[PDB]
Assembly symmetry: D3
């Protein structure tokens, strides 16, 4: 379309996967205001399309995202940030009911690591790096860089990456638990599209319920989490795809889900 | 005894280890109602026996448990699931004060992985695979498959395993935090019995207090957890086994605990 | 000062690192009342000094800390725990706003792993062993050996280490998420001092805000944690170090923070 | 039936209300093991009856319950109270999905106030008294006397009632929030039965979902509580009673629910 | 814009109060989709206006709001609600940073009480009635009717109002804690406008901070609530209104706040 | 002792009550640093005395406490508020294991209401007024004026008191849940001393455990709180005061507690 910083397109088989690529080779894909607004518009378009079942958010081959534009947040004060709700349009990815895959190739510093951790699945290349360099410019992460990273890779590693700003490899992120699969830099997007197609081959309402159940593991207790999980498991016996799946399991055949 | 789906026997030295083996190779150890009732009866028997200190739950050599029997809940609706307390007898592993060790050899999909995660120690074999294939039949896990899995392996890996139904190897569950030790297939049961003997060689009340203190790490905050742990530690100076152990450590000898 | 159980000195470049060494080779650095009081005094002195930006806590080359002194708690009862509260001065390390690095060489059993887990960054040697052998003396951990360890390495591994008393290696602790970097025994102190220098090379108020934001990940929920992180990010635009760092990032130059 | 401590009968219009009366005029309805077992059996019978929609738990005209029986717990030690779970049969009232009305007439001290607070609706008479006299015998409440009372009447009033053992009137309990309606002594049971009839006149599944939604306000946060409430509101559009009620609201007629 | 269901106008002296009046006497102010969209637009306009400091939400003299439009959600199924995010535009009131005052005169049943409880201050009239009639139509409250009500009036009164549908008076809501002041029907609007003027007579950033500090008392713990409150109290010494007010208090004069 | 801002003395029968009076008629008992240090020293002295069972904090007949001293915090900035941990000594009252009774006569504005709410039992006079007038000077409460007040009197009343600064009466605080008893101005001290005597007439360790169990109702969930209460009840069987009280109840005599 008329997007300036992102490239929106429908990739994959049968046009069931949405690919949002960050195209900004002049600032290492800086998360400016216009880029975030275009990303939110693309996410809304992909969430208002019954043909799309999964979204893949990727960047470039040398850098996924360099964070927020430091050259846009420099001449700001406390009143100009608190009475303008700075970085309020960055919590729109966590309100998406469709799965979002984060293909990370290259530098993922500052806002890039947060944007990747706000996704369901994090796929990184063989030459990917994750770090929190906010401490080097006199600030701290403010979009989920000290909450999800601490519960994902551990307290010690998160403390180190936040207080030192050191870069970790994809192997360290796989060992700790930040990423789920290491892929080559030239085939990461293809494997991400294949994973999004696997995901989009299932019932959309059941996928949304499963995503909510998994996300409810960081907001409540174990007992209440299991109770909400059992309630959502009870509330799925009233759909049409559950019975179809159980019938295709009993009788040896393929399951055709009707998204209902 | 008269068990139709399980094999209950007292194993280990001095008959201090309870072994519950699921024996039904005709459905890959389907978690039906009768099997769950027999498992609960065996757990109650092993909890009302002052000679058993630890329980070892195991399955077969090709499949630990293939989940709930889908050939029974196929003709169930929302009314037959909500006001019938479906799967209500599956929360008996979290109410047992004695440690339960899970020996996974083969396929542990859905209900098997849930029952494994509801145990304290998870021991898997080299030829073992863990997955949650609920998204392929039109439902979601409802017995702890989206809460205990996310807090162990990570958000990304849990999201992938839930939304794709893919199978992970024992090495992946070991490097992620789901399995604590990788063992051969032909020696997993013996090493699990040895671990249960090393557990049942200490004070039963102190072991139960330690189990409660460890399980309280997912039900509240860090400060409240530390305070409850300190209170449970203060509540140990009123028993005889703590004093016996301290005297044996000071005098450099062996401690004979009397479970009191 | 005139400390008999610890050695306090200002190490590092420009005397910006506080090295607290535990010198008790006769009891494997037993955590007695006097040693803990001296540790708290050293921590308060290093906290009330404007020239210290990070603290490095270490022990010996064969044992970091063998836990609490059993010779001072063997003849205690239940009434001697609520009244004249025991282990009440061990919660002075989690109240320090400056980063505390832990260098573990040798045995870290009981109270040693508990004091190491209360630190932000944990550095272990190639021949370091972490364990919670409280179940072998009739007691349970009482200073965070069942809350932070469970959330760090996982439920299964923590259950095993607590109910069996077995020792793990530095490689397993790094793979599970207990330590952040494995260093040689003869060069662990130098790398810890270098990490403390790299940490103290930034603004102290921003480092304290980052430490609090990371520590608030085990005391609140994800939604409330994100809002608290956004608040702490908004509350840094009123300082001079943030603007100095942003200017040094835009006008590419060395950043000189005034710790204000 | 054959109950020697309680009187179980089916009261109300069309035999839709269960009335459990504590009959022990010699011990002021002491909460012994036999009485609690009979109460649990009566609750199970009323929960396995499709004709009963609400339960009314009442006592006598001078005392509802005097608390735990002292003549059976005096010769008990720590190893006889922490083991075997003495207070494990008293939490069978919060696991009931049918509404339980607690008609409190007379003395409600110790375990009686807890048994009343473990119900949905608390009805008190004119000469009603609530107190926590456990502090006068050297113990503390252990069945919800310091958790629900603190969140119901306030911190200060609960602190006073726990640390002093003073008795409060029914008017003070109504002004604070302990009870919701003050009824005469001679007509308390009749008004409780009428309230139970008005409750049972609605769909049982909808009433159970509403009870779960209300009870989820003391175990979760407001943000996640609202999400669980919306999910349970979504999960009611698949039943017949919701459509029947909406049709009887649109067209001027009465709603006849089929409990499905 | 020109509204047909609500009346948006600037009231009070100096045009500092925004009054939203629900004008639908033909359906007792039914909370339909268009009415909620107009209410959200009016709230956004009043929140993006640098002259409005508080909002007063009111209805009519006989009914504030009769709840959600039942004549539009009757022909809805489980799929048409969970995959359409029904009632997703009703959480736009708890995201407003400016204080919202609710003036209830008449019937506030179902969605009316839910909309009133999402406001900071709740002002009711003499002939005002609050109830939850959702149980009489086959559904449950789904917009905060079982979470914000239970934590205000008590568990027993909330259970009664939810499972019986009974109507309470303004005196009961004042004695329980649902409303803050009882005012006449012909002067409730004027006193609400005066309260909004007294609220908007202070600094807007400090008012927003206090509102967030009070709202954080239901989403967090007391210990972390105190820490967040102390942080928000520290983060106010960098504004121009705090020092102005302190200087005016020291010099015994009036403080002229500039919202900065 | 030689206190210039407070008056410390032992009152009550047998010198079992510690009366701490705030004597500063020139500033309406301003909470300055010296006054807070003296209050903390007096609290520590009264908590380390085996002849003191309860503490009674009070002020004057015209004003209990006017809050923090504005004359020493006017020229403070964000750097002098985040650093040095300003107001860190105001959290020494919530760490006392002995009950603290608050006698409020006159004005209790700002810090006075916070110090009163940090106590267990709140006793106000007939001429007492509670308010949070921080919004009138440009700041917000920072010592529990927005966390305990919201849970005590409700959301609406707390919002009004914080955003308007209006003063409430003792009757409103009692009907809302802030205070527990209304007493005359000249006899409030005698009734508080009698309440402290009735509290100190029991076992100190059991009273401390009850206070902790009541305070754990604002930091944990309902299930976890009930479980911690049950654990404390089981631990109470390790002292002699419980057995003495039960024996005195069985043999119908007065119980003599020895705090062990
Ligand atoms: C809640 C959110 C919090 C935050 O995210 S705060 C910001 C956090 N991010 C950072 O602190 C670091 C951002 N980037 C860098 O430090 C470095 O770059 C790299 C480490 C990524 C390495 O890149 P290198 O090889 O050194 O080249 P280069 O010249 O510095 O970058 C090329 C162009 O990219 C612009 N750029 C890089 N990062 C940002 C950014 N965060 N905001 C705005 N622009 C950025 C640069 O300035 C420059 O542009 P020009 O040629 O015009 O000078
Ligand atoms: C809260 C609870 C949630 C849940 O657990 S929902 C259910 C989730 N679990 C699953 O979806 C796994 C279902 N099982 C399978 O997908 C496959 O099977 C396996 C991958 C485990 C193995 O496949 P293969 O090696 O090809 O063997 P095979 O012939 O399909 O199974 C052999 C026999 O075992 C029956 N069986 C397997 N799983 C179940 C099951 N979950 N419920 C009932 N029966 C099952 C089969 O049907 C068949 O039996 P027959 O010969 O009579 O056709
Ligand atoms: C809140 C939680 C509190 C707790 O931590 S409870 C206690 C938990 N900690 C433990 O259980 C560890 C106890 N220590 C040991 O088990 C062993 O030691 C080692 C595993 C560390 C192996 O050390 P080895 O090579 O076998 O030599 P050695 O002779 O036992 O130790 C040398 C000296 O060190 C003293 N010592 C060791 N640990 C402690 C301790 N925890 N408290 C007091 N002293 C200790 C010993 O007794 C002995 O001293 P001497 O030669 O005078 O007899
Ligand atoms: C997890 C929960 C733990 C708990 O709840 S512990 C319970 C807390 N402690 C109490 O409730 C005891 C306090 N009760 C009393 O002091 C008095 O009772 C009353 C306040 C109820 C007033 O009744 P009055 O008639 O004045 O005294 P009376 O003569 O002792 O009562 C008549 C009969 O009732 C028996 N009884 C009273 N309370 C209990 C009880 N809590 N447990 C067992 N029996 C009780 C008595 O013993 C006696 O019977 P007999 O004289 O023939 O022996
Ligand atoms: C998350 C959301 C949850 C919910 O809110 S679900 C819905 C829950 N709310 C209710 O159930 C309230 C419904 N009960 C009533 O509406 C009763 O009535 C009253 C208690 C308010 C008594 O009012 P009365 O004096 O009997 O008059 P009248 O029957 O209401 O006629 C007035 C006109 O107002 C329409 N109306 C009233 N409430 C609603 C509504 N909630 N939705 C749609 N229309 C409503 C009526 O139908 C009728 O209209 P016409 O004259 O055209 O028949
Ligand atoms: C985390 C905590 C945050 C906070 O607590 S902020 C402080 C509480 N916030 C407030 O805004 C409270 C202040 N408002 C007042 O203090 C009013 O006064 C009163 C309503 C309490 C009393 O009014 P009146 O009867 O007219 O007496 P008066 O002449 O103003 O006070 C007599 C002397 O007392 C000094 N004083 C009163 N409050 C404070 C205070 N909070 N800090 C310091 N001094 C105070 C005054 O200034 C004056 O003294 P002089 O005669 O020497 O001028
Ligand atoms: Mg891990
Ligand atoms: Mg109240």
């Amino acid at each position: 379309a008329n997007f300036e910083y992102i490239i929106a397109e429908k990739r994959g088989k049968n046009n069931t996967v949405g690919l949002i690529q960050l195209n900004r080779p002049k600032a290492l894909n800086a998360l400016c205001d216009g880029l975030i607004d275009e990303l939110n518009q693309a996410l809304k378009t992909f969430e208002e399309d019954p043909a799309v079942g999964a979204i893949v958010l990727t960047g470039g081959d040398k850098a996924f995202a360099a964070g927020a534009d430091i050259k846009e947040m420099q001449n700001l004060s406390f009143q100009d940030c608190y009475s303008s709700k700075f970085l309020k349009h960055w919590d729109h990815l966590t309100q998406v009911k469709k799965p979002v895959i984060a293909a990370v190739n290259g530098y993922a510093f500052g806002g890039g690591c947060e944007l990747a951790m706000m996704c369901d699945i994090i796929y990184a290349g063989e030459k990917a790096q994750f770090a929190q360099p906010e401490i080097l410019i006199g600030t701290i992460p403010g979009a989920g860089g000290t909450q999800r990273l601490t519960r994902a890779v551990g307290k010690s590693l998160a403390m180190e990456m936040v207080l030192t700003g050191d870069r970790i490899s994809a192997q360290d992120a796989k060992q700790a638990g930040l990423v789920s699969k290491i892929c080559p830099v030239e085939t990461l997007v293809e494997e991400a599209i294949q994973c999004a197609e696997k995901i989009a081959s299932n019932s959309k309402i059941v996928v949304a319920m499963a995503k909510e159940s998994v996300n409810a593991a960081f907001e409540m207790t174990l007992t209440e989490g299991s109770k909400l999980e059992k309630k959502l498991f009870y509330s799925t016996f009233a759909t049409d795809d559950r019975k179809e799946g159980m019938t295709a399991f009993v009788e040896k055949r393929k399951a055709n889900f009707k998204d209902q």
